[PDB]
Amino acid sequence: RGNNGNMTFNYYANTYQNSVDFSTSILNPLGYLK
Amino acid sequence: RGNNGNMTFNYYANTYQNSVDFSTSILNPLGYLK
Amino acid sequence: RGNNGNMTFNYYANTYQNSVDFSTSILNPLGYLK
Amino acid sequence: GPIPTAPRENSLMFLSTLPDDTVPAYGNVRTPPVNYLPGEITDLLQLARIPTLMAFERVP
Amino acid sequence: GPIPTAPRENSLMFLSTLPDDTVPAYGNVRTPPVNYLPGEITDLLQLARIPTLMAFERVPEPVPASDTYVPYVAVPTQFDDRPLISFPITLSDPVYQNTLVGAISSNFANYRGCIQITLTFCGPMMARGKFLLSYSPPNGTQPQTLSEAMQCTYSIWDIGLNSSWTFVVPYISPSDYRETRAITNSVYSADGWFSLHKLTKITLPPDCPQSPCILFFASAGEDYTLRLPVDCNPSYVF
Amino acid sequence: GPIPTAPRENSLMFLSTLPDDTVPAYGNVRTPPVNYLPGEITDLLQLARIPTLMAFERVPEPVPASDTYVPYVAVPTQFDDRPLISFPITLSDPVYQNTLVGAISSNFANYRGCIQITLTFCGPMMARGKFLLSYSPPNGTQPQTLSEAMQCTYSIWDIGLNSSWTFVVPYISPSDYRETRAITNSVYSADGWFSLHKLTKITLPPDCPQSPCILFFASAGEDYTLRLPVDCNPSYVF
Amino acid sequence: DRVTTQTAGNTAINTQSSLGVLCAYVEDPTKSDPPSSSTDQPTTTFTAIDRWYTGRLNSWTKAVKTFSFQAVPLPGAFLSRQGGLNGGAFTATLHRHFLMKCGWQVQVQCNLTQFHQGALLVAMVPETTLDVKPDGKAKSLQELNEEQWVEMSDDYRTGKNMPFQSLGTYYRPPNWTWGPNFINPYQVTVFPHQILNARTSTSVDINVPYIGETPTQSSETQNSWTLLVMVLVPLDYKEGATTDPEITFSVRPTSPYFNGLRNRYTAG
Amino acid sequence: STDNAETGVIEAGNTDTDFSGELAAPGSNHTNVKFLFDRSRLLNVIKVLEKDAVFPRPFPTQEGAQQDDGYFCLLTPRPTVASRPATRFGLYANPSGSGVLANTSLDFNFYSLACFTYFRSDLEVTVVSLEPDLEFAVGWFPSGSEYQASSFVYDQLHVPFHFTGRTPRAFASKGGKVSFVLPWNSVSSVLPVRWGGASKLSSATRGLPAHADWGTIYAFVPRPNEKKSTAVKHVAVYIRYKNARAWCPSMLPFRSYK
């Protein structure tokens, strides 16, 4: 999300827009007391 | 490929963009030992 | 043909682009010997 | 011919909050992976509801 | 709001070869019709394969008349063993000054393919001779006498009831396209000389005149293709 | 009316890496064909895994001939307990001056993965010896004698009918990518020294010459990947 | 194993302790096509010339240094006739055809004993000029026996020993440093090659198909595959071993392509 | 292991060739040769024409010649002296004296990656003026052709011909920059970075491929000849390679020791 107005399209493909990762092959709390 | 963001369209037809050839009518290694 | 990149569209209609004619109502050689 | 355009009053400016992105000058790179280390933050409010010790002026 | 845009480095320039069109300042007009007059041109190569008379330096008898340059060959009676006409193939040489393929090549940069030259006899019908014509790719020196022009590539030719002999210089080449003029006379721009020899003497009865004549033509063959124009030579206007 | 637009801050600039193309000023041309000549390159890594002869400083006998630097090892007969060759792994060290992976690494910034070095014997067939080669990740000091190079990671090697022994330095690392040269010789850019020791003496009959020789190669393994180029070093031209 | 009897035309060579083959860039190199740039009927192969020609190269001693090489061009070797090696019928053919096009089998020659050591390096580099010091005259058969080896100076390493041109006396005389043609001896094993030494082999082969800057270069000017032999570690032998072994070579054309008849070549 | 390298061909060996361990993931692909070269790179600078141009001579040239040197740029990566194809590369380190210094050029950082013998691409011409507040014009003619140089008068003003012609021109804006991509035009098949050969059949300098090139760019101001300033000015030229291919690998430039 962030802040964009790009609900139509982006110009470049997303692999030119920002880096993606490798291949190693309603919110949540922060640590319970068991 | 190279580096482009042109996943939508190019403006000119490709015969105006770069030269194409004539008509004479997973990668590979570089020379085996037979 | 000529030299264009306009394989998508032109802006104006063609009657505003260049003049067309009236109504009077693999190439060819240049003159045979009969 | 080119498509006719009309530049509006907002020319060449840059707004700090301007919700858009810019063409990269170098792209198609990869990165180290992420997933191994836990403890993400989606909202700081998951952060904000932790106890915190106040601070007072000492008695005379 | 307007669509966001980013002007690139190419602002407000105009390229000469730029393949696009511009908004008209006055439009919606009509024109007189066209169809009545025939003879269209789609390609100039339909133009380019018409015969054209070559132009040579006159043999050492300079007539003081204007431009003593000659579109034929004066065959001598005397026996000597050097060729009649020998000229190179560089399409800016002073033998290729007003041939068509020379002329519309003189403003282009590169061609590919064959070059027909043919030759039309003109003499009395009771005269008859045997003439061979020969072509050699670039050797070190120039092939001069009949053994050298013999080994290479030739055709002999009769004199009979017809009057010509269509000849086509073959197209051997290092690279497929070739240049049109030689800034440095290299192997890419020249292709060896062309010559024709008299094989047996011209034979003719008494009381008919000596020394017959032969005209030369020069035309594009089938594969002759051009490319990629260049700015012209305005030296005709001065 | 025209479509409303808004030019952003990036006006009329040109980026060097800018992934787009520009309008041609002359187009619709053809080219000579390609297909006849073989041997394409899709990736330079098909290039990068070819053997390459390393280059070392000559032992203290400087021959006054040009560039006394030596692509082999002169094993001595004498018993001493220090290694034969010891060199670090920083891909700009003067032992990695003209190896391929050093050479095409010298203009890139970061790599990932293994580095094969192999070594080809050259000596008389009646000679035979036992040589171990050993590798250690960065300790405080440098591992010097045979216990230290013994504990870490090694392979012993015979002399027989073949002549080599393919060795691969394993790839242990804090971070997955690693640098190519060390501006500050840190743990991220070096990975400990490499050495080889003689384990038992070279053994050879009479009337055959002393002191055999061994050549060194250096090649990329399988996982060796490169990234993200940088401007080059023009110091070869001066 | 290891016995390769190769028969072509009427000749037949075998090297009993050999190693194998080594093609380049395509596993079967002899396949080709007649060139597309020509228009004349090309003169293809014929069985009278499908041949191993052989020819003697210079011998080699103790006194050599590291990286010192011999290098023979091709097909320019056939012209000037080095080492008792001539094309014979083949030169009489390719004098008379302005376009020439062919690929090459080579297997080179030595045989050291079992009490020797020392590594040669047979390799054919593409598209080089390792036969001229910049005077403009290509070196010929007389000036080979005065050196027996090219002592590998720095001027080949920095590309300073390629023939430059007359600068013209309107300018300043320059200060040259670099040329794009060079030899970097720490690097020379990226070409089709195999270490030949007294370890395992005696004679060993390369094989290469065509490469070119154009479909067909000229007859008597181009030189694509110069082959060079260079020593990496020198020989050592006691008094009683066979002094100064001898080197020859064996060159085979495969599928020749001729084009364009004229008179036999006479140099201008 | 226990294979021997004397067969000329050895493969690579992962960690489990002789040790315990598994092979690592492929990181990236900034390696493919039609992506690696695509970088905007200047090769040199250019003195700007302002008059009827004249171009330099063939190989020898005695004194008393009148040419205007350093105005053309025969754009190739190959080494070039005085805007005509040379074979070596100069660096005039002690330039004191008389006799004019030639215009040298070379594409420096291209060779330090180049492990090739034959090359194939298209290029683009990016121009930029270094002096401020300037407006200019770039011209071009293809390889295997040559510049036209004359002048024809219009209303007492001598105007040269390179304002017009067939081959394309380009007029910049107020201190703008001009760029366009440019395709193949060469008579030969692929660009050589090494060559044997000679230009003509005999009596030629062995090594320079005179017609396997690209072309040249010259800069000039849009003014008549008689209104020319006394201060000279400069402009640079940039090339970025495109759609490249490559064939039959080779060595690298030798690094120092030194």
From TrEMBL, chains A, B, C:
Lies on the inner surface of the capsid shell. After binding to the host receptor, the capsid undergoes conformational changes. Capsid protein VP4 is released, capsid protein VP1 N-terminus is externalized, and together, they shape a pore in the host membrane through which the viral genome is translocated into the host cell cytoplasm. After genome has been released, the channel shrinks. The chain holds residues 93 to 150 of 2181 of the full protein. It is found in: Host cytoplasmic vesicle membrane; Host nucleus, Host nucleolus; Virion. This is Genome polyprotein.
From TrEMBL, chains E, F:
This is Genome polyprotein. It comes from Senecavirus A. It is found in: Host cytoplasmic vesicle membrane; Host nucleus, Host nucleolus; Virion. Lies on the inner surface of the capsid shell. After binding to the host receptor, the capsid undergoes conformational changes. Capsid protein VP4 is released, capsid protein VP1 N-terminus is externalized, and together, they shape a pore in the host membrane through which the viral genome is translocated into the host cell cytoplasm. After genome has been released, the channel shrinks. VP0 precursor is a component of immature procapsids.
UniProtKB/TrEMBL annotation, chain H:
It is found in: Host cytoplasmic vesicle membrane; Host nucleus, Host nucleolus; Virion. Lies on the inner surface of the capsid shell. After binding to the host receptor, the capsid undergoes conformational changes. Capsid protein VP4 is released, capsid protein VP1 N-terminus is externalized, and together, they shape a pore in the host membrane through which the viral genome is translocated into the host cell cytoplasm. After genome has been released, the channel shrinks. This is Genome polyprotein. The chain holds residues 674 to 931 of 2181 of the full protein.
